[PDB]
């Protein structure tokens, strides 16, 4: 099967309590997803960064050790607001400097917060990711009264999407991992 | 970061043990027909069968990803299991959330 390095961008924003903690639903999905990825191909690597608190933090560069991946999300902090652009730049550079170049490059963003960016800003990021051969899965959750947010995220996807290799999933507040398990984020 | 020797201790919090039925790693070793937290003596499929002694209320199970060890019901409490990884690189400890 496919050989792939994935960087997962966690939303640890103050928002993640509102709406099981939206933090806790994210952790469970990330856990199942790192399961799927490391199990499908032993040479796949997964890295984790957090987007909010007091700035973008890498908890682990891409690794095939599931224990390192799951351990580095025990006792997550929640607060501040996401820095999405800094998150994606740091995720793309980590993937660029992967060991095994035969790996496909994928970023996963959990967008659980309001998206405080213009369409044009996000298209530019999306086009740069595409020129860098990076695919993007976006998980949209926590509609904090922003009909603006879903539009902006679909505009990011359009700019990146290539060979239907990039995806978005809108999940209603009313089972995050059940939803994704049947979406191409998993399949 | 907690290590016993070269074995990493990996605390995993679940809303429900059913999450693990869908986990492409952990579905191989869990036996979901069994009551109370178990640990594995080896890494054969459905190996988590051995009763952990005096478990804390929110403990769901222990998976050692390598090594072999003593395989007895109600002999080892959670804290004693941490010294018998016997080559395990990771000791996964599954907890009920809140």
TrEMBL record, chain B:
It comes from Aster yellows witches'-broom phytoplasma (strain AYWB). This is Sequence-variable mosaic (SVM) signal sequence domain-containing protein. Keywords: Signal. It comes from the Bacteria.
């Amino acid at each position: 099967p496919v050989l792939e390095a994935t960087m997962i961008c966690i939303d640890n924003s103050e928002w993640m309590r509102n709406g099981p903690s939206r933090l806790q639903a994210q952790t469970e999905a990330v856990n199942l997803l790192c399961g799927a990825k490391t199990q499908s191909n032993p040479e796949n690597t997964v890295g984790i960064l957090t987007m909010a608190g007091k700035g973008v933090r890498v908890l682990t560069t891409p690794t095939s050790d599931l224990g390192k991946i799951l351990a580095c999300m025990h006792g997550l902090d929640v607060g501040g607001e996401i820095n999405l652009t800094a998150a994606i730049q740091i995720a793309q550079l980590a993937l660029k400097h992967r060991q095994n170049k035969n790996q496909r490059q994928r970023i996963i963003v959990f967008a659980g917060s309001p998206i405080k960016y213009e369409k044009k800003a996000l298209e530019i990021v999306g086009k740069r990711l595409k020129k860098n051969s990076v695919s993007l899965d976006i998980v949209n959750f926590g509609e904090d009264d922003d009909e603006e947010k879903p539009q902006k995220l679909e505009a990011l996807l359009t700019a990146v999407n290539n060979n239907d290799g990039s995806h978005i999933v809108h999940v209603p507040s009313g089972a995050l991992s059940d939803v994704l398990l049947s979406t191409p984020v998993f399949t | 970061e907690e290590f016993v020797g070269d074995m990493r201790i990996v605390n995993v919090n679940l809303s429900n043990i059913d999450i693990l039925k869908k986990h492409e790693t952990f579905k191989k070793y869990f036996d979901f027909t069994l009551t109370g937290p178990r640990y594995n003596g080896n890494i054969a499929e459905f190996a988590m069968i051995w009763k952990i002694k005096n478990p804390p209320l929110n403990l769901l199970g222990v998976f050692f990803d390598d090594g072999t060890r003593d395989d007895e019901d109600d002999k080892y409490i959670l804290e004693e299991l941490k010294q018998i990884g016997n080559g395990a690189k990771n000791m996964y400890i599954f907890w009920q959330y809140e």
